[PDB]
Amino acid sequence: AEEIEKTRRRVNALEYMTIPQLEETIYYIKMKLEENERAEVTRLIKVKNM
Amino acid sequence: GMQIGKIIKVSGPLVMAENMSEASIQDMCLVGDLGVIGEIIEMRQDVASIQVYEETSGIGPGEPVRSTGEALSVELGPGIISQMFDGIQRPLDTFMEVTQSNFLGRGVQLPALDHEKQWWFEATIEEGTEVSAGDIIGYVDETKIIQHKIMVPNGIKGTVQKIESGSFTIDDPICVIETEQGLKELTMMQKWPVRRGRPIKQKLNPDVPMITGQRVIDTFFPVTKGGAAAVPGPFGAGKTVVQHQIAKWSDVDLVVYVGCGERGNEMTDVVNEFPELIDPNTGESLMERTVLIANTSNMPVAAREASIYTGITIAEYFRDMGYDVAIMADSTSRWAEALREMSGRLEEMPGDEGYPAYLGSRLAEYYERSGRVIALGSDQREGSITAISAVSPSGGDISEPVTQNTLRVVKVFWGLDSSLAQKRHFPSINWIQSYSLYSTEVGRYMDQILQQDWSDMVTEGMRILQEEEQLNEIVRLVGIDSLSDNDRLTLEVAKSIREDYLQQNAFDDVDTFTSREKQFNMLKVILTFGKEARKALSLGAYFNEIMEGTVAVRERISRSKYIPEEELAKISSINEEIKETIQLIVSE
Amino acid sequence: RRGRPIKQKLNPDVPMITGQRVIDTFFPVTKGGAAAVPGPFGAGKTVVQHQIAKWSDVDLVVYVGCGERGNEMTDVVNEFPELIDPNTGESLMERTVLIANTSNMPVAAREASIYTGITIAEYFRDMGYDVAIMADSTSRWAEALREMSGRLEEMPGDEGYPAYLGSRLAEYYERSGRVIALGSDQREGSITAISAVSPSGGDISEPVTQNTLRVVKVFWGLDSSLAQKRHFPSINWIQSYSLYSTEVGRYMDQILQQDWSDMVTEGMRILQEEEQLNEIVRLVGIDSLSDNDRLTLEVAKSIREDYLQQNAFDDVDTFTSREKQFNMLKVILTFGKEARKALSLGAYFNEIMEGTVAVRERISRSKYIPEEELAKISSINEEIKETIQLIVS
Amino acid sequence: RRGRPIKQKLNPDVPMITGQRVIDTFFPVTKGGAAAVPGPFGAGKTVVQHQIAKWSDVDLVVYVGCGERGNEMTDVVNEFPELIDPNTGESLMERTVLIANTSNMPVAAREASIYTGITIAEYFRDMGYDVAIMADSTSRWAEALREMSGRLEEMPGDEGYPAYLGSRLAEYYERSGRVIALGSDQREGSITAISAVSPS
Amino acid sequence: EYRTIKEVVGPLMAVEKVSGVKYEELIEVRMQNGEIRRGQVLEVQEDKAMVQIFEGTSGINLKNSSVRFLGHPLQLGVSEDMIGRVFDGLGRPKDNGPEILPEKYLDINGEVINPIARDYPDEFIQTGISAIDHLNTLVRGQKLPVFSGSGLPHKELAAQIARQATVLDSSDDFAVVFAAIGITFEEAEFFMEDFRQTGAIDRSVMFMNLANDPAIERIATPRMALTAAEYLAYEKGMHVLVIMTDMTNYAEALREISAARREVPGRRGYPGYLYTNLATLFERAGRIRGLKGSVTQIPILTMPEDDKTHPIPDLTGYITEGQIILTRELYKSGIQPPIDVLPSLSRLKDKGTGAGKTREDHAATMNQLFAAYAQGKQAKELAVVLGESALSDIDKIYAKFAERFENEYVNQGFYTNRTITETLDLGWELLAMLPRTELKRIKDDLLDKYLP
Amino acid sequence: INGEVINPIARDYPDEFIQTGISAIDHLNTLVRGQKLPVFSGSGLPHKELAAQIARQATVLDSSDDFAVVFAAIGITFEEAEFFMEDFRQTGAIDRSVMFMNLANDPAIERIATPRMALTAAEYLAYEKGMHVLVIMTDMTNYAEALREISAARREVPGRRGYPGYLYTNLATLFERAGRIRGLKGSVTQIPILTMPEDDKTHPIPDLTGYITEGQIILTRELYKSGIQPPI
Amino acid sequence: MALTAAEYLAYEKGMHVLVIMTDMTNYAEALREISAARREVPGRRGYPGYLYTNLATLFERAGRIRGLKGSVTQIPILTMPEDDKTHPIPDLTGYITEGQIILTRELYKSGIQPPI
Ligand SMILES: [Cl-]
């Protein structure tokens, strides 16, 4: 019974903490990377016209 | 006939030319003395900014720029079938013949069709007849299969004054029409800009199922005549075989194949294997009713972008005749790569992942040009274009811009799966991930034309497959011997659907095509076994007794796919054997 | 800005003795080689470079303070004259040339300090000397190019750096190397380039580091996480590499008459295995780890703490000879090998660890054993084998 | 755009009584203090700020509808006159000034509404009153600045906002506070700033 | 008429030597081949006007083309004869119907309602959908959107509300304005066939914009629709319900147009003025003091990646007065419509419920049903993670409640219209499952009178 | 040195097995005569040793006539160029080879010219002299960086991730100068070699290359750190 | 201004000077305002390419001089935007200064004083 509960805690740690934190961070970084790429081309277009 | 421009600047792929004030925006041009392919992107006073789609090395100021006086267009007329073009309709076979080389020389301009070949024109309209766009004035027996119908061009309206049968080239005047602007002459060839959709009378709902003969498709994920389907193409999933099956078995009149911008050695395979495809009805090459567009990755970016447009304009042309056309594009991911390249070359504000912000619109423009229509003309004839498009994202992820925008405007998705191919399950169509939004309407059509509860059978068939997924997780965890008799049965019926129905050998003489009538009979017996065995369980019989008692009849079910079309009773009579065999089992 | 002409460029195949264990063993540089040390701020890049400048077996050191802290130049002029080579009697300053253009000195002079330094190094190279040139930091040179590019309103590359950044860096590093100099004598000389790079946020994907890694052959990636737990030198052993490892391995095998190449490969393999194990442990726990995997973690721990970690401020630990390095690594691997056998003989991980406390303490303090007393390290191998066999029975 | 002159600012050290338990107890604002209320949509930001407007022990409320819903401005004009003080028999509307520039009204006027409001607050502060200024929402003010920055073809800073976003915000809040007002009286007054923010 | 086109760069065109040209003025390009394209002045400077052509600049010869400046912005010719008629995105007839004679022409931007003249949304609109009418009530003058996703049945829900929506005790003054934005031919056909089959067309005005129509036409579409709605509401005295889908296609079109002008992109690539732009649409909803009539809006949108923080649903939620959420979990359970009442909200619902509007037991049962369902779902999730033996006897009752609530109450079918009386009565049936002692949100007077 | 574009219907399909002598390739990712099969590597990975090995060991079974190897070095260090040249001489592979060596401190315009010079030599030996030619080119990433330098000098606005919009056309024009041609005895086989910046396969250089070439051989740090040679 | 006063008091008036400057983030923001107004070619986050150099001209104004009794000790204070140490302001400052003392919200919330 104790081994079942120790396994259960490791399952819940992954399911309710570890995995969601990874999913949300991946989504965030992916978004932030795209934003910076657009800001970069925006600057280049400005510098172009200079 | 318009003013020739003079180059004032060469800067990489960008060329500027003055004296261009008589040209137009989006005109195709020949740049420099060599006369390489280019396009007018901008105009400031008389100064045109030109994107050049071939090497500009060796070009400098002072050299001429000649506009073609038109945007990218296609020649449409006798001599177009069985030919292989690139994205801008360069005749690849003719290039070999004329230039006597294995190369597409820079500056070489050759007409898309043969303007010297004699054709027999057969006149079918009488003099004095009032005509307008779409009206058929005659026909040419172009190939061994296809009759090419000569239609009155868009923009022409009036009274036929002179017409007769005879031998002509596509440049000869075959008809005299008395229009408002006076007497005008028609030839067998008309031009059309690839970016503009050929006009119709009315767009209709595509509600008639295509018969592909491929069971997984016709039954569970059907596409209609005028519908559209997306197909991911991972390596080793048997995509090309599925494509070949659809091209030769589907009940369409003509096929337009488009290679968008493919790896050189992969494009060669298509060039090789497609003419080797045999038309089932006539025994002729499939090329007898096929137009093929072949672009390698080093074709001009303009040809790779125009690939699908050049192809659908041609499809629209044969659609206007009253034909059913399949347009098959592979790969639209490579077409979109050309759009991504162009977006960067035009210094635009990029959309998602570097694709232009108008990616979604361009895809919508293409797919909405396919469909079932009433063509122009007094006949009010119907034609259709059914679009089958391969996508091939880098990682095989669907959520990427190209596949995502495609699935917003198409209603069918055939999810080819490489893991199924590794399990020898062919065709490798994932029955869980795939879908058809035509299923409900096709179901109504099928129930009517069969006078059977076909839609009830299909949904029940999918339900068993869906439940199989759930039951397999339990088998993996608990074990097969721990399931109930009802669950063990469901797994067997699902196994029979997968093996005896879904799995289909394209290279087997009989299994390569399954008629609509045969598909019904096959799904009937598979489900009838499930029904009778389940009725046996609730009457006191045991699962193993049913299995051990029905070895002979289940093998008849497994061989049903190989039963000839003339002997469909040998499938239908399995139903009686199932009920009789299981009856004895319930007894004993 | 003109490279001093030579007769012939040669292959740099003689390993530099820096005396720093992680470098000499896992990521070595040869005389005539080029190495970069990219790291975040506060990762100890300065101590690393000073250690190399003071302990390397070259004839001359050209140290270029490029756009950095003024006190670091003051530290060098005060410390160097006090560092006496006992085999010579001469200080390190009597073999050093210093070029200083601090961060608040004129920006354009950062580029000049770089070229001033390399030309002086080439001059002494031409005499037949082995020279090491330290550039700290090349990022400040790149930022001077970027600021001038922006003032000329040029179309920039990534992060505002001019698009010709990679070409400039290439012209510098291609001036380093082992050569035959001009003259009837055909004297051999060399320049070894050691350059600091300072990527923002520690992100090595920035243009300066990326363009540098395309032309240098050794990468000593400094790590913020190692620095925070005071693991020095904070070289990331998973990220770092040396293109000279195979050749240096051959040289060392011949010098030591030992299978040194295998030992280094085995050491790195254990470190790579620890990394893969840690990927699981972090997202699962050490609960289900077998005795073998637990042994792997202990051996890797010993490699990290007893070998890789090295205190530049300890009189003995500040420098480790090749032979002492060999003996230390031998001992560490030997414990792993003997413990491994004991596990297959039915002994438990917990028992093996509890019975070897005293000998593993000797391993942990091997780094402090005097060079004249290397027999106190080599003898550990016999204590390992005797102790572990006693545990088996 | 110019803060009304004072003698000197003082420490805002007297807690406001909003009567809202979570605020007065755990996260209190003082008279002359400033409070930001950033939240996602549909989190009750308008109910919170209305509660503060009607219950806080200030002499006057200046309520600025900056780039938001028209119905919320309609709710204020309907409800405020109906909220009668039992002691004095006066309504909340009889001590309120309302400034409204809704989301679909001219965008530049969002910035105008912010400064119109704080200046009126300073005016009543100078008389020796305690004033609350509610800005809902300051995010829409920043959007206005971003729109104009684009028209002017300025170099964008963080998220397309102009580089002077931070200093504009800092200058606004530094106009709030407890003060000794000008005059031989040396009278004291305060402005307490309550600002909604609407982070995407 | 000017023959002074100076530059064409992409969809953008510069016209020189002009006078009296205004910002946003509509223009007309007569091509060298007689073809006519319309455009809009984006910017006007001295003697130059920067214009964008709706249909693009492909094929245009500069020297032989001419530009006419029309002297007015984009307009809609309005009439009461619009009811029963189908138009495209620019208000052109799409149904082959008779000639339309406009009473007047109206700037499709409309005017801003004076905040002081605006009347708070009030009174009940019966949609016939229980989850809406009872728990998330739609009020006259409210903006109440539907947040959906790809593959979810928002098009069936849109068509159901469109034909079922009505006002009680008020005959022949209700109309629906239906705007389709950037949708495919086949989904347009779905809507057209459904309206005609049910007879909903007879009380509707339809504006149908397709996926392959010009992006500028796609963004003009909702403004054409709202201009028609305001005319019918404020000038004809009608209660008008405006349903628009898909607002996600609208924002994509806006982003496409924004990128064409090379404007600085905001969050996730969408324009920095996305909020403001959406507001100029959604704030046209409401009522006006002293006027008969009202405009009510139901914007329908698909949340990209089912992400509610995405700029499209996010900025919409900052503008609207609540939201109706469709979920895949409920859709996969066969619930029609798959409305999740837990994240759904109507902020103005109080103004459309109670005695004289619906019935006196409206608010109490709503509070109780919502509370019981949330507790029921909570108990269900507890049974999932810890097992059925982790629930108390009461928790089991609430779990069973949440099942019937989803299966019988929320689930009604896409062609079933429930009166508010039927919805309220059905709510009492579900509440009767629970012990009377557990109905703590309802006073004893209501319990004694209604509880079955 | 620009060459001419091969008519897509003039190309013949790759038929003959090429034995590289490397198990992980010959067996699991077979190289066929006329294919373009690139190596995707990274900084500090041993694509140098693999390139030398393949050029050294590559052969077709039977045939008698052997491989002429065109080796192009683009923007590499002298130390690496000397390794290649000395390996070719010490094994006699130089007698089969034509080498075009471009260094990191050579002009950007020379780096751009190098692949075109090498491929022009290959097509001449193959399509005019009837030889079977194996073309090995490293490092293609150095080629791409040279393009950015010229592009910036013309003040061109970059496309995705800082590279020219026409990068695809550019790479495609180089990599498609390969394969068998109908009616011709000789052929060109290509093995482009590139380092993936930050080991990122979504980077424009390896991403676009994979769209053009018929597969890729991938080297990894995990295998190399474990002492696997070659770390495929 | 402050550093000129400091170096004066230290090196011309023989004092030991402690310099405290807050908030350095507000200094960098002002630099960016001017850089943006001049339409200069932006670096990271819109900050000018010369941010490191500019900050160095301030922080390097500290230390001691041989033969002089005085000294300048600097304690600059900056708030890290979004608590992000990799932001240009704390990142570049860290490459210049002789260490840094970092306060965290985690330690602060746990009642640690100072939350270093
Ligand atoms: Cl809100």
Q: Of B436, B460, B483, which marks where a domain is finished?
A: B436
Q: Is B164 exposed, middle or buried (0-12, 13-18, 19+ CB in 10 A)?
A: exposed
Q: How big is chain D by its Cα radius of gyration, in Å? A: 17
Question: In which element (H, E) is residue F153 found?
Answer: helix F140-153
Taking the C-alpha atoms of residue B337 and residue B342, their distance in angstroms, rounded to an integer, is: 9
Question: In which element (H, E) is residue E299 found?
Answer: strand E294-302
Residues C278 and C389 in one domain: yes
Residues 6+ apart with CB under 8 A from B142: B78, B79, B81, B119, B148
Residues C226 and C369 in one domain: no
Q: Of C227, C242, C257, which marks where a domain is finished?
A: C242
Q: How many domains does chain B have?
A: 4
A39 and chain D: CB distance < 8 Å anywhere? yes
Task: Using DSSP bridges, classify how beta strands F39-41 and E5-9 pair: parallel, antiparallel or unpaired.
Answer: unpaired
Cis? peptide before G114, omega within 30° of 0: yes
Taking the C-alpha atoms of residue D63 and residue D71, their distance in angstroms, rounded to an integer, is: 14
Nearest to F47 by CA among F83, F93, F17: F83
State which residue of chain G sits closest to D166, comparing Cα positions: G29
Taking the C-alpha atoms of residue A11 and residue C176, their distance in angstroms, rounded to an integer, is: 55
Taking the C-alpha atoms of residue E198 and residue E189, their distance in angstroms, rounded to an integer, is: 14
Look up residue B86 and give its amino acid. Answer: D
User: How many angstroms from the chain centroid is the CA of residue E107?
Assistant: 21
Taking the C-alpha atoms of residue G4 and residue G8, their distance in angstroms, rounded to an integer, is: 6
F197 and chain C: CB distance < 8 Å anywhere? yes
Residues recorded for chain C:
393
Residues B230 and B302 in one domain: yes
A38 and chain D: CB distance < 8 Å anywhere? no
Residues C85 and C125 in one domain: yes
Which residue numbers of B belong to the known binding site for ATP?
233-240
Residues 6+ apart with CB under 8 A from G71: G10, G16, G17, G63, G64
Residues B80 and B45 in one domain: no
Residues 6+ apart with CB under 8 A from E46: none
B122 and chain E: CB distance < 8 Å anywhere? no
Are E409 and E430 in contact by the 8 Å Cβ rule? The answer is: yes
State which residue of chain F sits closest to C35, comparing Cα positions: F44
Are F28 and F202 in contact by the 8 Å Cβ rule? The answer is: no
Go through C177-212 and write b for each residue having 16 or more CB atoms within 10 A of its CB, e for each that does not: bbbbbeeeeebbbbbbbbbbbbbbbbebebbbbbbb
Residues C227 and C249 in one domain: no
User: Does the CA dihedral E119-E120-E121-E122 come out positive or negative?
Assistant: negative
A1 and chain G: CB distance < 8 Å anywhere? no
Taking the C-alpha atoms of residue F178 and residue B269, their distance in angstroms, rounded to an integer, is: 15
CA of D120 to the centre of ligand 1 (A): 27
Q: List B residues 557-586 in contact with F (Cβ-Cβ < 8 A).
A: none
Map tokens 């520690």 to a residue: C202
Residues C282 and C221 in one domain: no
G60 and chain D: CB distance < 8 Å anywhere? no
- For chain A, how long is the longest CA-to-CA vector? 72
Look up residue E193 and give its amino acid. Answer: E
D155 and chain A: CB distance < 8 Å anywhere? yes
Go through C361-380 and write b for each residue having 16 or more CB atoms within 10 A of its CB, e for each that does not: ebbeebbebeeeebeebbeb
User: Does the CA dihedral B347-B348-B349-B350 come out positive or negative?
Assistant: negative
The verdict on whether residue D150 carries a ligand-binding annotation is no
Go through E35-59 and write b for each residue having 16 or more CB atoms within 10 A of its CB, e for each that does not: eebbbbbeebeeebbbbbbbbbbbb
Which residue out of F157, F160, F161 would a mutagenesis test of the A interface target, given it has the greatest number of A Cβ atoms within 10 Å? F157
Domain residues for B239? 73-116+187-436
Are D168 and D159 in contact by the 8 Å Cβ rule? The answer is: no
CB-based neighbours (< 5 A) of ligand 1, an ion? D 41
Q: For the domain that residue C347 is a member of, what is the CATH number? A: 1.10.1140.10
Taking the C-alpha atoms of residue B554 and residue G4, their distance in angstroms, rounded to an integer, is: 98
State which residue of chain D sits closest to A40, comparing Cα positions: D156
CA of E146 to the centre of ligand 1 (A): 16
Map tokens 């090295």 to a residue: C310
* At least 3 CB pairs under 8 A between chains F and E: no
Contact G33 D154 (CB under 8 A): no
Tell me the nearest-neighbour CA distance from E267 into chain A, angstroms. Answer: 7
The verdict on whether residue D74 carries a ligand-binding annotation is no
User: How many angstroms from the chain centroid is the CA of residue E430?
Assistant: 31
Let me know the angle formed at the C-alpha of C177 by C172 and C181, rounded to the nearest 5 degrees: 110
Residues C126 and C272 in one domain: no
Q: Of C212, C242, C272, which marks where a domain is finished?
A: C242
State which residue of chain C sits closest to G99, comparing Cα positions: C42
What SS3 class is residue B419?
helix
- For chain F, how long is the longest CA-to-CA vector? 53
Name all domains of chain E by residue range, CATH numbers in brackets. Answer: 1-452 (3.40.50.12240)
A50 and chain F: CB distance < 8 Å anywhere? no
Residues B175 and B197 in one domain: no
Q: Which residues of F touch A30 (CB under 8 A)?
A: none
Residues C284 and C146 in one domain: no
Q: List G residues 25-44 in contact with A (Cβ-Cβ < 8 A).
A: 39, 41-42
Residues C95 and C207 in one domain: yes
Closest CB to F155 among A37, A40, A48: A48
The secondary structure of residue B251, as a DSSP letter, is S
Resolution of the experimental structure, in angstroms: 2.2
Taking the C-alpha atoms of residue F231 and residue F216, their distance in angstroms, rounded to an integer, is: 14
CA of E345 to the centre of ligand 1 (A): 12
User: How many angstroms from the chain centroid is the CA of residue B170?
Assistant: 28
State which residue of chain D sits closest to E109, comparing Cα positions: D104
Tell me the nearest-neighbour CA distance from C89 into chain F, angstroms. Answer: 37
Contact D65 E115 (CB under 8 A): yes
Taking the C-alpha atoms of residue G58 and residue G74, their distance in angstroms, rounded to an integer, is: 10
Contact C163 F153 (CB under 8 A): yes
How many other β-carbons are positioned within 10 Å of the β-carbon of residue E29?
Answer: 22
State which residue of chain C sits closest to G97, comparing Cα positions: C69
What values do phi and psi take at B484, rounded to 5? -75, 165
Taking the C-alpha atoms of residue F175 and residue B401, their distance in angstroms, rounded to an integer, is: 27
Are B212 and B229 in contact by the 8 Å Cβ rule? The answer is: no
Taking the C-alpha atoms of residue E219 and residue E225, their distance in angstroms, rounded to an integer, is: 11
D100 and chain E: CB distance < 8 Å anywhere? yes
Residues C9 and C92 in one domain: yes
Nearest to C41 by CA among G76, G49, G116, G96: G96
E269 and chain B: CB distance < 8 Å anywhere? yes
Let me know the angle formed at the C-alpha of F96 by F90 and F97, rounded to the nearest 5 degrees: 85
**Tokens in use for B407?**
């699935």
Q: For the domain that residue D160 is a member of, what is the CATH number? A: 3.40.50.300
Contact D200 E323 (CB under 8 A): no
Nearest to B457 by CA among B526, B516, B557, B375: B526
User: How many angstroms from the chain centroid is the CA of residue D132?
Assistant: 7
